[PDB]
Design a protein around this ligand. Structure first.
Ligand SMILES: NC(=O)c1ccc[n+]([C@@H]2O[C@H](COP(=O)([O-])OP(=O)(O)OC[C@H]3O[C@@H](n4cnc5c(N)ncnc54)[C@H](O)[C@@H]3O)[C@@H](O)[C@H]2O)c1
Ligand SMILES: NC(=O)c1ccc[n+]([C@@H]2O[C@H](COP(=O)([O-])OP(=O)(O)OC[C@H]3O[C@@H](n4cnc5c(N)ncnc54)[C@H](O)[C@@H]3O)[C@@H](O)[C@H]2O)c1
Ligand SMILES: NC(=O)c1ccc[n+]([C@@H]2O[C@H](COP(=O)([O-])OP(=O)(O)OC[C@H]3O[C@@H](n4cnc5c(N)ncnc54)[C@H](O)[C@@H]3O)[C@@H](O)[C@H]2O)c1
Ligand SMILES: NC(=O)c1ccc[n+]([C@@H]2O[C@H](COP(=O)([O-])OP(=O)(O)OC[C@H]3O[C@@H](n4cnc5c(N)ncnc54)[C@H](O)[C@@H]3O)[C@@H](O)[C@H]2O)c1
Ligand SMILES: O=C(O)CC[N+](=O)[O-]
Ligand SMILES: O=C(O)CC[N+](=O)[O-]
Ligand SMILES: O=C(O)CC[N+](=O)[O-]
Ligand SMILES: O=C(O)CC[N+](=O)[O-]
Lengths: 267, 267, 267, 267
């Protein structure tokens, strides 16, 4: 077991197509004892997570709720038991209002919506680290989900800006995490066919947006020297578990690219 | 004159130590007709800008004020004359509340403060582009002021995150600017001894923060193969004018490093 | 005149489609006094360069010839006159044997051929800097021609590896150049339809290789927010002149992208 | 066992201080069946490798020897047995003549020495890939040792250029490796006190060189949020083993930084 007898918090499960679900699944398969956090639809998330190989306590976490973050460490300690600490934390949380994405013009996205997006997608990685580092063991690992924003691309728009902010936050979280002997890193995943992506490809945020994202997917597999399967989140999940493990102990404030090596090729 | 006959909006003058003041000065020296935008203390800015080689109309622009941005293009056209468009736009605007910087711990920065900082420092570049692109000529140039946030550093904290977000926004503005035949680029300047900068070195955001920024400055000059004078904004100002000129016509969504080449050296 | 009164050595003119020819043309148009350097076919280069706006002394330089480099500074001083120094140096030199490029498998390139390519394309930038820095004025500029090798691509193969080596060498040349008050920078140009480029598209280095280069140049124009005209070297030439000028005085060991902003966009 | 049942070739053991020795050690600890390759001093290498947890066949490989590379796959197949293939390949090979490093001026390095350096340090990664990919299983992994050359630094000089070339080669090897279902990645390690490094700090390549490398070391630990122990190669070894494992299956043509996160921080 890669994560044998490691206590790992996993956020960001909403459906069985969620990357976080596949992270949670592979984590438990490798002997990790999980604490799950969920947002808004808790009855749904509890039902979805019942299909995981092992049962895991589910805590409510809205990263925009200061009370939720303030109480989180206590609620996690209650779930995993007194005198026990976290060895792992997975940030798999991302949102951007429709106005900040798709055929909705880049300039027409009002800041109130962008701010909400940056709050949930970027700042939330710092606030999660703050809440949970006090209850994290030395040799611990914090991992966030990233989408390479080094270059602008159609439709992703302000979500790309939010990911650029996240990458920057990760490098600062790493500074703080370092004091606790804890690593902080992002996995830059290739495109994964979640509900949200499938909807976007289906034209949910306008036709050209779906068209450009479908062209982006196809270009991604073409470029990737080992190919890229957008319907298979397992390679991403295994990469998150690699960073949660003891086998990247000199990597922090950094980004691991689980993208089939697409970002290393132009074509 | 590098910018002979070019009409250029220049934001972000507050004092004569402002990078924007030195941009404005060098721009006018090179035959540019300037429109100035100023925030909050207009009587002050009007007095400061009277020392510029040529007199320039000063417009009020708070980038957080929706009415100011909505009205901006009209007020600019009124100043430069009907049937006349801008050839240049300088974003020299930046702010992060005290909580987002210095010895004020990175995790203790409330999002309301970080959001206000990202609004003025990152989003404002997109909203300035939205307002002004409709009144910009083909072959035009938009330039923003950047501080390399590729790597985390002490004290700069959430301002670095704000700069990471700005870099991402610039790449998207470039996509929109391209339709108007306009270029969008950032100048990544080295540390410049502004009033706010001197205050920070003086320990205005805590002793440890001032100590770290002073060590960062000294390391910057050491690394820079052509040295770095933090008391000389002229090389930064000349670099902005180079991007405002017709002499970088194939560069857009990009970053020019006016840092003495410090970012290209480890030491 | 951007380069009025400046004495600039320009290498790498072989035909009138050469980037160096357009660099030389734009430089002379901006009041630069040129020293030209040519390889092997001197009669040809002399004839081609007669079409430049002004006549310029032509010196033989094979960068693989130690005597040519040893004697260079002397021969340049004789041409521009004793007591006069160079203000500018353009490295527009590039070669990789057929085996190092095209459908010729990457692994099948003999090192003897790769080494010849790296010698001419990468090391020669350091060689030219060594020979010429002693006869260069303070505030001077050395500029090399680059093709972004940050990501691998089809056909370019070992030429990409050579460009990666050049980028690295440039950063070290900048350290040495710094002592002389001289800047060292690369222009990362987009694809330009030179004789060799046209031949390669025509299938000169195999059909599949020509097909991939044609898809690369087409993808380049699409990505570029301000488009990319591969038949127009003028934007590249103007960018070199910008670096040779006094208007990027805080940029060294660095890379300016004259690529229509293609490298800042994914699509 | 992380590498349970995996057959892995490991090059670049010369002493027990070698990074390759620690890679080899940690690999065997994790259930890997090793083939070792050695250069020049074979009686020494056999003696050194006797201290490894398990007995491993040692094959002679000079990467500059065409006969050695042509015969390698056969000699490896003989060692691991007919109908058995490699699941892993470790390139831990690096050399640059004294003239290419230290206080020996950057410009004074003759290309013959630089070419020899680039041959062993960069090209050899492609040579090993060519020889060994035919006898490598799907889901296989090739790993090379890298020192981040993204920024120039004192003393490392042409070895940095060689590492820049290696990074570029890796991205091309990945394209070829991809056809065999094999990944190709570099581990960018922080400075490790090998016999060679200890000698350099001792002033073996001049006093100023040793002084700069000692300042680089100390700055590295300072910057690294989780610190950096240059006397501990285990974190580098564990990182190579992570890439050799099945736990980074979507990472190829890429670079993993085993540097304490030093490359993510400025200070
Ligand atoms: N799907 C892709 O193609 C892709 C690629 C790379 C990176 N990512 C990143 O992966 C992460 C996971 O997203 P996904 O693709 O699995 O989609 P998803 O919708 O399944 O996951 C997003 C999660 O964010 C949670 N969330 C939203 N707002 C929240 C809030 N205020 N507080 C707490 N949780 C909140 C949702 O409940 C959900 O569980 C995101 O950070 C996303 O940006 C996505
Ligand atoms: N000084 C440095 O060391 C340094 C280094 C690199 C980049 N920069 C960047 O240079 C730019 C200019 O800053 P500076 O260093 O000249 O300092 P400065 O204080 O002189 O300039 C900042 C400007 O931002 C303006 N501003 C603040 N809030 C605003 C708002 N809501 N609407 C409109 N304008 C607003 C201020 O009025 C001021 O004119 C900033 O973007 C800064 O981040 C600074
Ligand atoms: N054409 C493109 O698409 C493109 C794109 C970006 C960068 N570049 C770079 O621009 C530079 C100029 O090449 P180009 O595209 O104008 O083609 P070109 O063939 O016109 O220029 C190459 C030049 O190299 C010279 N040269 C070759 N071997 C030499 C040697 N041993 N000593 C001295 N000079 C030697 C040739 O004589 C010729 O003048 C090269 O470095 C090339 O890699 C080209
Ligand atoms: N030690 C560091 O500070 C450091 C940091 C990062 C990366 N690296 C890289 O790690 C790798 C291993 O080097 P090291 O630091 O363990 O030092 P080392 O001297 O122990 O290892 C170098 C190895 O290269 C081998 N070698 C030299 N020429 C060869 C040839 N022609 N054919 C085959 N093998 C040959 C030597 O026999 C030796 O085993 C190198 O690629 C090095 O650049 C070193
Ligand atoms: O967030 C991302 O990066 C993917 C966009 N999406 O489908 O939610
Ligand atoms: O804003 C910056 O990037 C630096 C100057 N400052 O205000 O601290
Ligand atoms: O060298 C280059 O980058 C392009 C010139 N060429 O070989 O076609
Ligand atoms: O090879 C390296 O990068 C480490 C320097 N050294 O001691 O050989």
């Amino acid at each position: 077991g890669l994560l044998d007898g490691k206590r790992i918090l996993v956020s960001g499960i909403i459906t069985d197509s969620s990357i976080a679900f596949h992270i949670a699944r592979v984590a438990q398969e490798q002997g990790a004892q999980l604490v799950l956090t969920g947002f808004d639809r808790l009855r749904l998330i509890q039902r979805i997570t019942d299909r995981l190989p092992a049962k895991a306590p589910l805590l409510e976490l809205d990263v925009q709720n200061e009370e939720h973050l303030a109480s989180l460490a206590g609620r996690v300690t209650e779930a995993i038991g007194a005198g026990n600490k976290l060895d792992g934390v997975v940030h798999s949380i991302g949102f951007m209002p429709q106005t900040g994405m798709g055929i909705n013009p880049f300039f027409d996205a009002p800041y109130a919506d962008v701010s909400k997006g940056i709050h949930i997608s970027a700042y939330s990685y710092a606030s999660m680290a703050k809440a949970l580092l006090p209850i994290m063991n030395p040799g611990g690992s914090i991992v966030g989900m990233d989408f390479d924003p080094s270059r602008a691309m159609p439709a992703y728009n302000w979500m790309t800006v939010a990911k650029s902010a996240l990458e920057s936050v990760n490098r600062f979280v790493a500074r703080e995490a370092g004091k606790y002997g804890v690593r902080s890193n992002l996995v830059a995943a290739g495109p994964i066919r979640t509900l949200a992506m499938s909807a976007i490809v289906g034209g949910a945020l306008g036709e050209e947006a779906g068209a450009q994202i479908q062209l982006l997917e196809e270009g991604w597999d073409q470029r990737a020297p080992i190919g890229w399967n957008m319907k298979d989140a397992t390679p991403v999940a295994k990469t998150v578990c690699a960073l949660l493990s003891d086998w990247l102990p000199a990597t922090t404030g950094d980004i691991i690219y689980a993208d089939g090596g697409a970002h290393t090729q132009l074509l």
